[PDB]
């Protein structure tokens, strides 16, 4: 009986460099134990741009974590890593399950030119 906090997806996978992109990390607790409050941080290539602690994550239920990331335009590819509680306050199931390393690109279609 252990919370297996798994960051499943990070949408959108391609981001518009026009605004502060409220991205949605879908964290699903794929373990049969309801998890308590946990700090989900967005690590861009290692740096922590934003941290949003979630109230709770139920067993086999998913929570939508909204990140507050201002697109810098520093790169065309960002290595967004959703590390579910890097402090391991809630000891998760599998070691590599609490992290999500996914490349997000800059969206070709922009809502605004610049």
In sequence order, the 6+-apart residues with CB closer than 8 A to the CB of 13 are 102, 104, 105
The experimental method behind these coordinates is NMR
In sequence order, the 6+-apart residues with CB closer than 8 A to the CB of 51 are 39, 40, 41, 42
Mind spelling out the 3-state secondary structure of 33-71? Answer: CCECCEEEEEEECCEEEEEEEECCECECCEEEEEEEEEC
Tell me how far apart the alpha carbons of residues 23 and 84 are, in angstroms, rounded to a whole number: 15
Distances (CA, A) of 65 to 50, 51, 52, 109: 11, 10, 7, 24
List the one residue out of 1, 2, 12, 21 whose CA is nearest residue 95: 2
Q: Cβ–Cβ contacts within 10 Å for residue 2, how many?
A: 15
List the one residue out of 33, 36, 32, 38 whose CA is nearest residue 7: 38
If 0-12 CB within 10 Å is exposed, 13-18 middle and 19+ buried, where does residue 90 land?
buried
The class that CATH gives domain 1-114 is mainly beta
Q: How far, rounded to the nearest angstrom, does the alpha carbon of residue 16 sit from its chain's CA centroid?
A: 17
Q: For residue 52, what are its two tokens?
A: 């949003």
């Amino acid at each position: 009986m252990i919370p297996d906090l798994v960051p499943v997806s990070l949408t959108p996978v391609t981001v518009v460099p026009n605004t502060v992109n409220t991205m949605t990390a879908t964290i699903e607790n794929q373990g049969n134990k309801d998890s308590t409050s946990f700090n989900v941080s967005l690590l861009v290539d290692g740096i922590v741009v934003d941290t949003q602690t979630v109230t709770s994550l139920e067993s086999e239920n998913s929570t939508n974590v909204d990140f507050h990331w201002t697109l810098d335009g520093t790169a065309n590819s960002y290595t967004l890593t959703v590390n579910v509680d890097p402090e391991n306050a809630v000891n998760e199931g599998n070691e590599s399950n609490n992290t999500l390393t996914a490349l997000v690109g800059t969206l070709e279609h922009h809502h605004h030119h610049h």
